[PDB]
Design a protein around this nucleic acid. Structure first.
Ligand SMILES: [Zn+2]
Ligand SMILES: [Zn+2]
Ligand SMILES: [Zn+2]
Lengths: 187, 121, 121, 186
RNA sequence: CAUGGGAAAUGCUACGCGGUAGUAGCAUGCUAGGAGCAG
């Protein structure tokens, strides 16, 4: 608070005070100078106090509304991300089998658990040990869920290609045993 | 009660009469002191409020009949003190300035801890 | 990460942001370089620019320390103090920094274009 | 806060008021000096307050990013600090088999797999020379990890099955040095 | 050897109130950060 009307009033009051003090006038002159100093101090009170609070409230408003703008921009970004994710996941499912099996439904509404059970084009099987692998996925192909499945690629826990020949009784303890087998819908 | 929320209830004399104080197992407190994640307590000089908080729950071990638990409480007090003073040396010597008022004495006298169980706040 | 002043070999925690290689500089040497060269950006464990929303004050001479973060003059907490003062800049090793006389050559290297023969000479 | 201009003004007021009260001049004089004293104490204590305040904020920032730097360097150096600490505990505990295998690794004789705990479970050790054989592998008896082992097969680098009695000083150069000893506990 | 009214004026001092500013102390409420314990 430097360029204020109360600053000018106090400056001129102090100029009068110092001038009449260096002059060395009567005691009433000194009392008048004291009164002028007072009233100018009164004037300078609000003009150096109110503006500080006004600046503080303006600054907090600026912070708040800047934050509001930032929030809305983030909202737009997230909306765009969500819709593009939807539209990009959607375009890899529409087999004619889906329409086929929805038409046979009495009103369209079918249980969810059957859609991958009938329309999925790839199957992953997780195998704990060789005993289980023996009577489930023996041979290059096998059947499950009333359909034929042909085995394409088999990986171990460390994601390493394992040949089906290597999978045997004697060779069993030489592999990690969350075995993963992925297959295609053989037809 | 023998055990409730993993707190053992002890009856001792506080002030002018007797009240109940729930005290924890000691092994749990010592284990929490010993094993931590990295930097969270790898060097306590970085972070001291951990042991301050730990001690508050170890205070009712002082009034225990067996004295080992009071020994644990005093060990925590001594470690807090040593950490604080060695932090003071490290900070004052090879940097410039630390201290105009201490205000940190309170964290090694049982007066501050006992206020935690005073029936008035 | 701390290092020795490039013009003093004294430990320091200051590097000029505007310098290409950003060498370690003691508070005296760094102050002389910032006050001599147009380089007004200094890199420490954290950048010195104003931490206020939207505010983009970069000149350290115009920046003030506040609530454990740097601030501009406008965005100042009630009790603040300008960073660059007393011929040095606020940081680590400020006491132990010695100060040498190589600001001319350092400024020339940090401001030359290497086109003339002065860089090789 | 003794070397301050406000301290100087307060000291001047103190000296003048002390002179007035010692000499006993008048009432308005001591009132003037008391006013001056209030003014001087006001701007000598208020500025002392906020300067010590700035000093302790300075200390707060110093200690804050001091801890920051300490934390960063510690998390940079963990990868070697842990190894050093482990070796210190090792050389502090010093179990007989522990030191035995430590020295065997030090000279370059280590197991190629996990040490088992049964008389079964063949364990393979790599011995790259013939002196350690005399040190350790005496006949078919292999004393490793404070345990006795019966040597069942020794092979060289080029997978040539190395016979037991064939190994000797004269024929030692004519043998692939990185020998592997496969033995079961005795 | 039987003691003086009203008015205003200028202090000086004391007393009451309010404000402003400044300082310091107290308690609280929110927020943020960091932490610890219990299920
Ligand atoms: Zn620079
Ligand atoms: Zn330097
Ligand atoms: Zn700013």
């Amino acid at each position: 608070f430097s360029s204020l009307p109360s600053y000018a009033a106090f400056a001129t009051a102090q100029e009068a005070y110092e001038q009449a003090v260096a002059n060395g006038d009567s005691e009433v002159v000194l009392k008048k100078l004291k009164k002028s100093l007072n009233v100018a101090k009164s004037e300078f009170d609000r003009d150096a106090a109110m503006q500080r609070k006004l600046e503080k409230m303006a600054d907090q408003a600026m912070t708040q509304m800047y934050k509001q703008a930032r929030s809305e921009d983030k909202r737009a970004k997230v909306t765009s991300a969500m819709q593009t994710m939807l539209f990009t996941m959607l375009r890899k499912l529409d087999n004619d089998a889906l329409n086929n099996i929805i038409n046979n439904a009495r009103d369209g509404c079918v249980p969810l658990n059957i859609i991958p059970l009938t329309t999925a084009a790839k199957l992953m099987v997780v195998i704990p040990d060789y005993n289980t692998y023996k009577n489930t996925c023996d041979g290059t192909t096998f059947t499950y869920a009333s359909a034929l499945w042909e085995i394409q690629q088999v990986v171990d826990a460390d994601s390493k290609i394992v040949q089906l020949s290597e999978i045997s009784m004697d060779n069993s303890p030489n592999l990690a045993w969350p075995l993963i087998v992925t297959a295609l819908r053989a037809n | 009660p023998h055990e409730f929320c993993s707190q053992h209830t002890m009856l001792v004399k506080q002030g002018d009469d007797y009240v109940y104080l729930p005290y924890p197992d000691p092994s749990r407190i010592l284990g929490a002191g010993c094993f931590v994640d990295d930097i969270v307590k790898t060097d306590g000089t970085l972070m001291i409020e951990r042991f301050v908080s730990l001690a508050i729950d170890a205070y009712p071990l002082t009034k225990h009949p067996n004295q080992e638990y009071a020994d644990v409480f005093h060990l925590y007090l001594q470690y807090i003190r040593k950490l604080h003073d060695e932090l003071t040396g490290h900070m004052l010597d090879m940097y410039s300035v630390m201290l105009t008022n201490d205000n940190t004495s309170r964290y090694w006298e049982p007066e501050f801890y006992e206020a935690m169980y005073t029936p008035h706040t | 990460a701390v290092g020795a002043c490039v013009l003093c070999n004294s430990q320091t925690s200051l590097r000029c942001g505007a310098c290409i290689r950003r060498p370690f500089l003691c508070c005296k040497c760094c102050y002389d370089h910032v006050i001599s060269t147009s380089h007004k950006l200094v890199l420490s464990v954290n950048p010195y620019v104003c931490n206020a929303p939207g505010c983009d004050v970069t000149d350290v001479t115009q920046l003030y320390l506040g609530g454990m973060s740097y601030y501009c003059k406008s965005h100042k907490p009630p009790i603040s103090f300008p960073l660059c003062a007393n011929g040095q800049v606020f940081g680590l090793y400020k006491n132990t920094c010695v100060g040498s006389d190589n600001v001319t050559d350092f400024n020339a290297i940090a401001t030359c274009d290497w086109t003339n023969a002065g860089d090789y000479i």
